[PDB]
Design a protein around this nucleic acid. Structure first.
Length: 1566
RNA sequence: ACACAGAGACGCCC
């Protein structure tokens, strides 16, 4: 290893070439540990390096044994000295040696070695080593080195003639190396190894010595002192803990620590379970007798038929046996009226006398029509004439509440369908309806109209409604938006979107969404008994009769339309029947909740997205027209049906076809066994769609077992043939089959849970409690060959803990416990209580809410952590380490730990504040250990993508050319409530120093006696019913436990809580479970490596084993090199048995394998949800397309588009193209203008027409982007182009030209904010006290007042506005859209309407001519240089040309450095303001280097001053609160993208990506 | 109509 070869091979060009940071990981196995001795004396350090072990050459052969010492002055750079011993040439060239003179002050720095080539080409490099565990240290050190040695070395370039200079820095850390030169991944290992040895030397020297230490900081002394004092003085009173908490004795811990693990038991148990696994494999896959794979596959098929025919004999017996049913799937009429204008045409050729004859709906409609026609029409349709007055000049919406007479028969018929049916329950006709409604359907029900609907439907035909009001409005808005990028590429995609918008399904979804939008605003209204509300849709003549109930209950509607009006109808028999009343079509009363008003409002946008997505995935070009194929129609119809049904179990049947179809990827000798998921598809059937889905799922279940997917290796890449859609029966390619598993994600996640269905989550919580062992001897005391439930083996746990120590000491050195202790002490001691108090909710279930017959008249509320830390502030604590003792005392005195349960969705374990304070330290301790694990991903985010990809490099170097890789995905059964806390305590205490033992033992032991509180409204309807008639065991047992008939081990008589001892929780204990499973997986890896050393007949099968682990899911990779056909067969059999043994070896650790694990797959593995088919990484883009419209509640109108762009970029990162992203953005435009009031407000034409003359995102304008780089650029780039292209920049000049001597429209949307403010007692001085002394805001928290003021500032922030909200965003936001434009809603005091703001901006702010001068440009947009050089490359393609190339089969995940960082900005401006204001050092610039930027900022922003008081008086920011957010929110930030596609090695990469990723199989070219 | 292997809602308040 020498630097001269590296300097001779480097590619250096004339000018300023800086390259790009290339990151290299640790992929190779380091040989051994250089045992060494360190002695401290005054004469040096006397390092005695021993003979390093060396079994494999390279990566550790450069170490020379001998006696070397360093005097006690260069002891702070032992890492730097030893790491770069072979590279640090003693040349010592000062910068004045190669450059004549500059005299810039910093003229005496020597950038390490600056050795040049023969042709005078100067190459400069600096060496640096940091002790960091993540890339957050690597990139930081890189940036520090660049900012320190860039401008000095670049100042000498302009004076020279033809300079050729290259600047790069190498940063070495234990775990990864970051550099600029092309390292060979062989000397990088050398550098990392020598860094590890140097870290060992420095740690050993620093241990016994104390004077040799770099002065770290003054701040990192108090934290260590506080933490050490606490852990030396905290006595948790263990002698009371054992008597209070069950199964908690320190003797168990000391015996576990001080006893070696027995080897005889481990060998015998392993050998027994191995032959048990072999016997199971022989029995369950028909290996014996010896049969070829035709007849055993036929046996598998017939056996799967035998299982699948028995499920449809127990589903057919607990249900009614009706084989014919006329129930409709879609509860909406299939009408497609033409979009006319607002005109009430209720007059008929034959008068309202024929309506009286047809049923009761006809009579109701007739009475309504007589009331409307011969009455005052003031609420049916809004009147724009008397609407401007409240809008253009300086809660009250009107509705037509008519009261018909109706007969008792008609009222009863209405009451059958739920309309005012609470009073009518007792009569006979309602009881029969209620009794029949509970029955489940039969699997043999005849459904064939659903199957016919998916084959022949006119959902995609073009309706000639492209010249109507709504379509023309959308076209005008789109043309206005796409005016700064007017090319052919934009026009073609706009034409495609316009053509997609005129489909039958989209036109139907438009008025369906309008109806849902209008219903969403009708919940907030109440009416007396017998009242109804009549109204009309905006662009369609459809009349709705609405019956609001409570605003949290059902709302009822009926639809009516003239028969001659219905021009076209949809084809299919999946729609509900309609009443034919003369020349009128009427609809029965239907119900709809507030949580089901989300998929209906978003229906047209989802339909458009589905059309575009499946059109590209079938290969159809977006700029062409084709007759729709039979594949597109089936997928669109399936999406339509799933969106319109919106039921929980419908999602599960489609969700559980992935695990059905990952079988068939299983290679011989193992057989595909899909008949393992039959235990999950055992539930009630309540809709005709679920029966069809179940039958199709069983058909594909048999089809998979009949034959697996073929493997066709053509050349260099393997391909699978035989793939098919699960519920379609049709054959497609691999990616369509992969992402058709996520069609069930169109169902809304956020459904409220009724009190009827609340008992299932308690069943899931309490199901493992009846299996508690009677005598605890196997719970952490001894060993067992065959442990029972909840039991584990101590010897195997110790073996796993020891196995995950030889993977830690081999990377971070033999001295890691000391560094771990220092990091943990620093992390715990540096946390203040102000870092706590988030928006998370606590619980108030302490002692009084315990007996049920006391709190009957009391309603129970939760709380928030804010008040619970505010009371500690008022009592007075400043550090987290002080409050934890009082928390422990409170927990110990009341000997329990309190949990409340609150799901209300489709869980959550909220916890008391004291328990949160106690468990925060334990989570902090576990997190610092999880980041030291080689294969643990939930604490190391970079490891998911960097350990499966690096398996190929190891398998190629170590084995050779051509290796059979064999993977095995594995996921576990009920991970929660299946782990005993003693396991976690012992595993965590194995890795701690002796001081973190009593604390962790006491903190963990509190989890073992729980008390979960159940809902009071559940108990209200449980005390009344003495005996239950339910056919469920849990329902029959719970009421007896509550009343007293039974004596059940988890509830008492009359109490309102649930006791549980055996179990962990989801959430709270997160990193400890990951650590335990990492120990288990390290044991498996060691055991597999041990078995591969042996073999079938004493012959060693060469291969490598890789393991990836998270928190709940894991995978195992094995690759071998047989080079013999008989050895091929026998080696694959051995590896298959070895991978099958994991299921039997798991229960020894208290871990249960699930039925959703795929074992023994050759070239396929999925880890989280990421499929790795050889070189064809697939992510499901449909998962992120289905969640594109999941916006949150924000106040500013410019904050909606930021969330829209945030949702838009994630689908692009998921595999979407650029045309797809542009179309999704068009759909988002439609969604934004719909929630802005497109078809809800009558005064929208004026607002739109006046928005044409004034584009402004903060005023409600949606900005599009370039339809070639469609997702990479964020909202800032769009804002920059808008302000530099149109009147936005010219109009914005008044904000620095009119006030010389960013959103200003804040919405008001809110009843539980003032209560929160007064609850935690903020004084009414929180703003003026900051105004006089801004010291409390920037510096630090010193005492009570600073903490209180900083907390008051934190509460009054925009983050709490988004955080404190309900879960239903879209209906709540669109409900306020009915009055947004007209009524006074916005704020600047002086609340006004949107029309008023738009008018006042028109005549005052617009009358200007000019542009923003290019000196304030680098304040709003301090990132504009690379804006310009990216926009320049984007300004190269303006037409639609190119050729349809053939795809390349190398799809990999890339990373494009779109916006690295501008280095000329020399960090940020807020720290500079604090520097010049507060007398605090905050910028990394020395004497007078802090200057030369104050003048620049003063030129950028006027009226600033060095004195804090002058800046207050000068500008509009008449406070010190708003100015902090103003200066902080607009600043330069790094932007990157992770696009998926063909690999790129080495500005041309962006053009390459644009030219390849515009459309798959298409190249734009030139 | 919604929910559920019949635990709820189909309004509160006077």
């Amino acid at each position: 290893m020498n630097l001269e070869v590296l300097c001779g091979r480097i590619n250096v060009e004339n000018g300023l070439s800086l390259g790009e940071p290339g990151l290299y990981d640790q992929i190779y196995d380091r040989p051994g540990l250089p045992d060494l001795d360190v002695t401290v004396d005054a004469t040096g350090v006397t390092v005695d390096i021993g003979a390093v072990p060396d079994s494999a050459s390279q990566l550790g052969s450069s170490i020379n044994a001998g006696l070397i010492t360093i005097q006690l002055s260069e002891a702070y750079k032992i890492n730097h000295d030893f790491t770069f011993s072979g590279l640090s040439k003693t040349t010592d060239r000062r910068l004045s040696e190669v450059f004549p003179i500059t005299h810039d002050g910093s003229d005496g720095m020597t950038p390490a070695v600056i050795h040049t080539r023969l042709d005078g080409t100067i190459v400069v490099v600096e060496f640096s080593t940091t002790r960091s565990h993540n890339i957050g240290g690597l990139e930081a050190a890189y940036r520090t080195k660049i900012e320190k040695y860039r401008d000095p070395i670049s100042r000498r370039v302009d004076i020279m003639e033809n300079p050729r200079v290259f600047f790069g820095v190498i940063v070495v850390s234990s775990g990864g190396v970051l550099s600029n030169m092309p390292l060979t991944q062989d000397e990088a290992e050398e550098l990392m190894y020598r860094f590890c040895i140097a870290n060992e030397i420095y740690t050993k020297a620093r241990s016994m010595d104390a004077d040799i230490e770099l002065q770290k900081s003054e701040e990192e002394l108090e934290a260590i002192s506080r933490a050490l004092s606490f852990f030396s003085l905290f006595e948790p009173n263990i002698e009371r803990v054992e008597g209070t908490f069950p199964n908690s004795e320190i003797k168990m811990l000391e015996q576990f620590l001080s006893t070696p693990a027995d080897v005889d038991f481990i060998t015998k148990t392993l050998k027994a379970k191995e032959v048990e696994a072999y016997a199971d494999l022989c029995d369950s896959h028909y290996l014996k007798p010896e049969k070829t794979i035709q007849e055993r596959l036929e046996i598998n098929r017939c056996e799967a038929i035998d299982k699948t025919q028995d499920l449809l004999a127990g589903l057919h017996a607990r249900s009614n046996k009706q084989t014919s049913l006329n129930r409709g799937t879609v509860k909406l009429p299939p009408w497609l009226p033409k979009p006319s204008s607002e005109s009430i045409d209720i007059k008929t050729d034959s008068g309202f006398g024929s309506l009286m004859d047809h049923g009761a709906y006809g009579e109701l409609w007739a009475k309504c029509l007589l009331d409307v026609s011969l009455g005052n029409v003031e609420g049916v349709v809004s009147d724009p004439a008397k609407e401007l007055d409240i809008a253009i000049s300086d809660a009250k919406i009107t509705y037509r509440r008519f009261k018909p007479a109706l007969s008792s028969s008609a009222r009863q018929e209405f009451s059958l369908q739920g309309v005012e049916g609470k009073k009518w329950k007792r009569m006979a006709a309602n009881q029969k309806k209620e009794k029949e409604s509970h029955e489940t359907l039969s699997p043999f029900l005849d459904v064939e109209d659903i199957g016919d609907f998916l084959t022949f439907n006119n959902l995609l035909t073009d309706s000639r409604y492209g010249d109507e009001s709504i379509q023309r409005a959308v076209s005008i808005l789109l043309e206005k938006a796409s005016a700064m990028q007017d090319t052919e590429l934009t026009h073609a995609l706009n034409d495609s979107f316009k053509r997609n918008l005129s489909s039958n399904v989209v036109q139907w979804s438009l008025w369906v969404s309008c109806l849902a939008q209008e219903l969403a605003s009708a919940l907030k209204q109440h009416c007396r008994a017998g009242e109804f509300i009549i109204k009309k849709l905006k662009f369609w003549p459809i009349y709705v009769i609405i019956k609001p109930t409570k605003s949290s209950s059902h709302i009822f509607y009926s639809l009516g339309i003239r028969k001659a009006d219905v021009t076209r109808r949809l084809t299919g028999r999946v729609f509900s029947d309609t009443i034919d009343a003369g020349e009128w079509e009427l609809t029965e009363f239907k119900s709809l909740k507030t949580c089901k008003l989300t998929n209906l409002v978003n229906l047209p946008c989802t339909m458009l997205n589905s059309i575009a997505f499946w059109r590209e995935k079938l290969g159809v070009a977006p700029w062409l027209v084709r007759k729709p194929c039979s594949e597109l129609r089936e997928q669109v119809g399936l999406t339509f049906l799933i969106s319109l049904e919106d039921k929980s179990k419908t999602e599960e049947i489609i969700t559980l076809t992935r695990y059905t179809q990952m079988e068939g990827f299983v290679s011989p000798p193992m057989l595909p066994k899909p008949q393992k998921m039959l235990g999950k598809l055992d539930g009630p059937l309540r809709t005709k769609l679920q029966v069809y889905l179940l039958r199709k799922h069983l058909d594909c279940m048999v089809r998979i077992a009949s034959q697996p997917f073929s493997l066709i290796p053509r050349e260099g890449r393997v391909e699978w043939g035989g793939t098919f859609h699960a519920i379609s029966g049709r054959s497609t390619n691999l990616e369509n089959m992969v992402n058709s598993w996520y069609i069930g994600y169109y169902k809304n996640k956020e459904e409220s849970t009724e009190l009827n269905a609340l008992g299932e989550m308690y069943k899931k919580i309490v199901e493992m409690e009846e299996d508690k062992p009677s005598s605890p001897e196997f719970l952490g005391w001894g060993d067992t060959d065959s442990p029972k439930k909840h039991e584990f083996s101590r010897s195997f746990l110790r073996a796993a803990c020891s196995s995950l120590e030889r993977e830690i000491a081999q990377r971070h050195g033999r001295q890691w416990k000391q560094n771990l202790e220092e990091r943990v002490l620093r992390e715990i001691g540096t946390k203040n209580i102000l870092d706590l108090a988030s928006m998370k909710a606590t619980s108030n279930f302490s002692k009084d809410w315990e007996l049920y017959s006391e709190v009957q008249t009391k309603e129970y509320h939760r709380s928030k952590l804010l008040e619970k830390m505010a009371t500690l502030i008022e009592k007075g604590v400043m550090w987290y380490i002080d409050a934890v003792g009082q928390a422990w005392k409170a927990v110990l005195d009341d000997g329990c730990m309190r949990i409340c349960l609150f799901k209300k969705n489709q869980e959550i374990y909220v916890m008391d504040a004291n328990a949160r304070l106690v468990q925060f330290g334990v989570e902090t301790m576990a997190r610092c250990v999880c980041e030291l694990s080689p294969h643990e991903t939930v604490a190391n985010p970079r490891l998911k993508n960097s350990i499966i990809e690096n398996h190929g490099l190891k398998s190629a170097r170590s084995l050779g050319p051509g290796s059979i890789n064999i993977n095995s995905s594995n996921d576990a059964k009920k991970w929660n409530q299946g782990h005993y806390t003693t396991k976690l305590a012992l595993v965590l205490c194995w890795f701690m120093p002796a001081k973190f033992h009593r604390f962790i033992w006491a903190a963990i032991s509190m989890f073992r006696r729980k008390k979960m509180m159940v809902d009071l409204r559940f108990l209200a309807h449980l005390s009344s019913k003495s005996e239950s008639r339910s056919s469920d065991p849990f329902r029959e047992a719970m009421t007896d436990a509550f009343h007293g008939n039974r004596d059940v081990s988890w509830m008492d008589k009359g109490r309102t809580y649930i006791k549980t001892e055996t179990g962990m929780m989801q959430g709270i204990l997160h990193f400890t479970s990951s650590l335990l499973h990492s120990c288990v997986q390290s044991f498996y890896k060691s055991y597999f490596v041990s078995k591969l050393k042996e073999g079938y007949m004493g012959e060693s099968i060469s291969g490598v084993v890789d393991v990836i682990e998270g928190s709940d899911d894991s995978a195992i990779m094995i690759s071998i090199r047989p080079k013999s056909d008989m050895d091929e067969v026998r080696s694959r059999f051995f590896v298959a048995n070895l991978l099958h043994s994991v299921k039997f070896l798991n229960p020894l650790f208290g871990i249960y394998s699930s039925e959703k694990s795929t074992v023994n797959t050759v070239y396929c593995v999925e880890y989280n949800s990421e499929f790795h088919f050889h070189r064809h990484l697939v992510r499901p883009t449909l998962r992120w397309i289905a969640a594109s419209h999941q916006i949150s509640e924000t106040e500013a109108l410019a904050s909606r588009q930021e969330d829209y762009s945030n949702l838009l970029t994630q689908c692009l990162e998921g595999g979407a193209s650029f045309s797809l992203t542009y179309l999704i953005q068009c759909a988002q435009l439609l969604h934004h203008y719909m929630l802005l009031g497109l078809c809800l407000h009558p005064l929208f034409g004026t607002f739109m027409g006046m928005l044409i003359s004034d584009p402004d995102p903060a005023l409600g304008f949606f900005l599009m982007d370039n339809p070639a780089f469609a997702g990479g650029a964020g909202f800032r780039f769009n804002l920059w182009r808008a302000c530099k292209t149109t009147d936005l920049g010219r109009k914005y000049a008044y904000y620095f030209n009119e006030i010389q001597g960013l959103s200003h429209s804040v919405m008001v949307y809110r009843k539980k904010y003032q209560a929160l403010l007064n609850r935690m007692g903020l004084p009414e001085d929180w703003v003026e006290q900051i105004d006089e002394n801004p010291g409390v805001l920037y510096r630090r928290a010193a005492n009570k007042k600073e903490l209180l003021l900083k907390l008051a500032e934190k509460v009054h922030s925009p983050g709490v506005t988004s955080s404190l909200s309900k879960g239903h965003v879209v209906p709540r936001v669109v409900a306020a859209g009915v009055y947004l434009l007209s009524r006074h809603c916005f704020r600047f005091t002086q609340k006004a309407s949107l029309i008023k703001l738009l008018m006042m901006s028109s005549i005052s702010a617009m009358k200007h001519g000019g542009s923003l001068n290019p000196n304030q440009e680098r304040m709003l947009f301090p990132q504009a240089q690379e804006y310009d050089r990216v926009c320049t490359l984007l300004e190269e393609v303006e037409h639609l040309t190119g050729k349809f190339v053939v795809r390349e089969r190398n799809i990999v995940r890339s990373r494009i450095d779109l916006f690295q960082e501008p280095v000329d900005l020399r960090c940020k401006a807020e720290d500079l303001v604090s520097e010049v204001w507060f007398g605090l050092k905050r910028t990394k610039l020395g004497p007078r280097l802090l200057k030369e930027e104050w003048d620049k900022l003063r030129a950028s922003f006027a009226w600033l001053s060095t004195d804090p008081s002058e800046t207050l008086r000068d500008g509009p920011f008449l406070s010190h609160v708003q100015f902090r957010n103003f200066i902080a929110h607009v600043d330069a930030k790094s932007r990157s993208v992770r696009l998926l596609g063909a690999p790129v090695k080495k500005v041309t990469t962006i053009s390459q990506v644009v030219r390849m990723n515009f459309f798959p199989g298409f190249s734009l070219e030139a």
